[PDB]
């Protein structure tokens, strides 16, 4: 079984999903789903399409180079099946993926910090440049307090 | 090709039912009634917790 990625989508293709395409140069183009497949025929560019992962690794979004991401490459030399490798890899894959998420969430906070600065500078323009609307709300509070009275 | 209801194939199939494929059935019927006799033993011990 092979969880191989979409050619266009970079999402996992579980066994039983998606179409394969084979070029006459004989390399295989496995596809996530029909949306990615019909967009491939039409000669698009996933550097340009915003929803795919090839855009997001290129356009300065979600982190691309990491020491945790080099653990799952491919192996063309088979490792002869010792069990005590297998018992640690089932503990390794639960450990690499946690450090992946603690770095990816921390990479998201570098990209979204200081929004509250621009959130508050946006509010100084709305409040201060509308003096006439702020008179209307003052009588709205006084009419609110008087109805309870 | 011989049909489904030919006399020769129904005789060859009758020999196989005397042999292996009934012993795999007769082993299955004993394993199943083991769990059915354990199913009362669970559901009486649930009744004994009401009696405490």
């Amino acid at each position: 079984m092979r969880i191989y990625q979409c050619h266009f989508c970079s999402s996992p293709c579980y066994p039983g999903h998606g179409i394969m395409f084979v070029r006459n140069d004989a390399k295989e183009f496995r596809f996530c789903r029909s949306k990615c497949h019909k967009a491939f025929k039409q000669r698009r560019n996933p550097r340009k399409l915003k929803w795919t992962k090839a855009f997001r690794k290129a356009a300065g979004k979600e982190l691309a180079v990491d020491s945790t991401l080099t653990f799952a490459q491919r192996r063309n030399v088979p490792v002869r099946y010792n069990r005590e490798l297998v018992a640690t890899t089932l503990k390794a894959m639960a450990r690499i993926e946690e450090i992946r998420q603690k770095r990816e969430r921390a990479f998201y906070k570098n990209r979204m910090r200081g929004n509250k600065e621009k959130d508050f500078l946006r509010d100084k323009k709305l409040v201060e440049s509308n003096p006439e609307l702020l008179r209307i709300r003052e009588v709205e509070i006084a009419r609110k307090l008087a109805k309870e009275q | 090709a011989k049909s489904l209801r030919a006399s020769s194939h129904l005789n060859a199939k009758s020999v196989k039912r005397r042999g292996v494929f009934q012993k795999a059935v007769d082993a299955r019927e004993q394993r199943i009634s083991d769990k059915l006799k354990e199913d009362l033993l669970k559901q009486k011990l649930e009744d004994l917790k009401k009696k405490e």
């Binding site: 579980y14 979600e62 990816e104 | 004993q30 199943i32 009634s33 059915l36």
Partner: protein, 386 residues
């Protein structure tokens, strides 16, 4: 003339009259007979069909070209809660047929099966079995006679069961009564068994196990009044034909001066009762068992319920049966699972299956992810998260 090109008939004459069935629960026509040396064992079971999924399997089949290779295939998942017993029925062989001569009920019934006897529950005084449980006084003895009568007479014994619909996400509140025959020997041993299971529930693995070839019967998928072409498979007349093109052209010859009974007219399609045999159980999971969908390979703690549940059906949290191919019927419908009717002979009835992966991606769209922890792992964090 002589028809000039012989061709097979369109449609099967065996499954006639094509008409709507008598009930949503399809009745069972015949059971596996009796082997009167065997232990007491139930012969059928009833549960609720819910959705489909995919299965990969390392095919261990001698002789095939897919020996020792992997094969993907589709199974059904039938929600199977435990089923509780409420009655015994005995039948006397006549020279006319079988005849029921006694039913015996069980001192206290669930509110699901007081609900079967009413069509207007909320106005009713709920008086279903009140005069019957006063006949369980000091010794009973109006029961023990009707037990002893079945022991003396009554060549075969059938046992009344019903489902537990309140344990199902299906919103219907009303259980289905059924009759199931027994196959343990010496009918005194049959009827002593069933008296020891009144008000007492039966599991599913006490009736089946893996690698078994069973058969499912139901009432299949209504479609209303359907024209001849999609009903029988008749060829379409070419284009712009007068009086239509989706029909049989010549319905009869000049003799006999009657439309015969075999010329494929239009009418009801669907909602017939059917029987499909030789369906093979792969997997019998447990309700209390967490990680039902995890095989020996996956080791990922996940249940067979796909993400966001099945489509038009909720969550599983009961016992289930995963049987390959496609059961006749649709989702949230009642199927009945008989067992095999005869000793099967092929090697396909004998194979020990070994599941390798169960799909649990969502059926409500082109689903890509298995667990909701995968989707958060792959997407990264989101705006509503922080």
């Amino acid at each position: 003339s002589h028809r000039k090109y012989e061709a097979p008939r369109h449609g099967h004459l065996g499954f006639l009259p094509r008409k709507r069935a008598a009930s949503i629960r399809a009745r069972v026509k015949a059971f596996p007979k009796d082997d009167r040396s065997k232990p007491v064992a139930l012969t059928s079971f009833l549960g609720y069909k819910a959705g489909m999924t995919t299965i990969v399997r390392d095919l261990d089949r001698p002789g095939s070209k897919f020996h020792k290779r992997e094969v993907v295939e589709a199974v059904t998942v039938v929600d199977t809660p435990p089923v509780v017993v409420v009655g015994v029925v005995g039948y006397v062989e006549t020279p006319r047929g079988l005849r029921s001569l006694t039913t015996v009920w069980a001192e206290h019934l669930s509110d699901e099966v007081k609900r079967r006897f009413y069509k207007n529950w909320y106005k009713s005084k709920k008086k279903a079995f009140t005069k019957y449980s006063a006949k369980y006084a000091q010794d009973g003895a109006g029961i023990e006679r009707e037990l002893a009568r079945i022991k003396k007479y009554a060549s075969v014994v059938r046992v009344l069961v019903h489902t537990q619909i309140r344990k199902t996400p299906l919103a219907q509140k009303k259980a289905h009564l059924a009759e199931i025959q027994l196959n343990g020997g010496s009918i005194s041993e049959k009827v002593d068994w069933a008296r020891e299971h009144f008000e007492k529930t039966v599991a599913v693995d006490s009736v089946f196990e893996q690698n078994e070839m069973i058969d499912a019967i139901a009432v299949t998928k209504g479609h209303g009044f359907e024209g001849v072409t999609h009903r029988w498979g008749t060829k379409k007349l070419p284009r712009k034909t007068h009086r239509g093109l989706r029909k049989v052209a010549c319905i009869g010859a000049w003799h006999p001066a009657h439309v015969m009974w075999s010329v494929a007219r239009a009418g009801q399609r669907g909602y017939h009762s059917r029987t499909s045999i030789n369906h093979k159980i792969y997997r019998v999971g447990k309700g209390d068992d967490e990680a039902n969908g995890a095989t020996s390979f996956d080791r990922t703690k996940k249940t067979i319920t796909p993400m966001g549940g099945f489509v038009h059906y909720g969550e599983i949290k009961n016992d289930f049966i995963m049987v390959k191919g496609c059961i006749p019927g649709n989702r949230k419908r009642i199927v009945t699972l008989r067992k095999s009717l005869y000793t099967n002979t092929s090697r396909k009835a004998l194979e020990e299956v070994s599941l390798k992966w169960i799909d649990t991606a969502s059926k409500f769209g082109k689903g890509r992810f298995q667990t909701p922890a995968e989707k958060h792992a792959f997407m990264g964090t989101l705006k509503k998260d922080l």
